[PDB]
Amino acid sequence: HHHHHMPVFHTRTIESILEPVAQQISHLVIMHEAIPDLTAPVAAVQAAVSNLVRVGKETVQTTEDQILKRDMPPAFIKVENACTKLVQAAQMLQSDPYSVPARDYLIDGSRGILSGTSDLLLTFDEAEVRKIIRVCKGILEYLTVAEVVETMEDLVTYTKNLGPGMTKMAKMIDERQQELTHQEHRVMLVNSMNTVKELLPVLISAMKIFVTTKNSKNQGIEEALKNRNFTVEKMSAEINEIIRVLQLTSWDEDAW
């Protein structure tokens, strides 16, 4: 009588790993059927989980990523706990193959393993996104340097630096949106990136005008400054929106 929900995974990669399990769990939940001796297959799951936990502990204990270090354990904890339910189920089924409580454990344990493994994969996914965010923040920081460019020589250096930086950022975003399952988020990323790319030449043009105006005589630089600053502000707004969107999740990603 309880309703359930199989996840719409966060990325295509996670989907390809976990979809089979989710589909098989759904099939068993919906099925109309005694259960055979599951001691051995459950033991194989137990062994796999133990290996995974061992590797997870090594990672937690060696990673310099303080955030990964903190978010990982709860996921492995959920997986281990769910595994204990499968073990209990197999033990119960040895004496009573028709046990209803045993079947309940099998289902809860299977779902808990799916949910814990998904949580685990999402923690590693978040670490990957943090790498993209770091690049975005480097661009925001470099945009603050525009105001210090006051010679044509420095403008050449600046453009030759910001240009490739934007290209790298754009590539990371393009690759990321291609991995996302949620269409709404992909659209936002692509739209913001396009806006940012379009503003780049506008910024360089504004900086060239500022440099030219400054290095002249009796010209007022107030307008050139304003126009440069306006463009930097718009670009920074767009990049912050990319950073915000890269971190969005969805309710439909939960399994229950």
Partner: peptide, 24 residues
Amino acid sequence: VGWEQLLTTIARTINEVENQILTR
């Protein structure tokens, strides 16, 4: 789909996840 098959799948999936970690 049966319990024996689902359990085999789970074990394989877990091994897959461990491998992802080991290669990262």
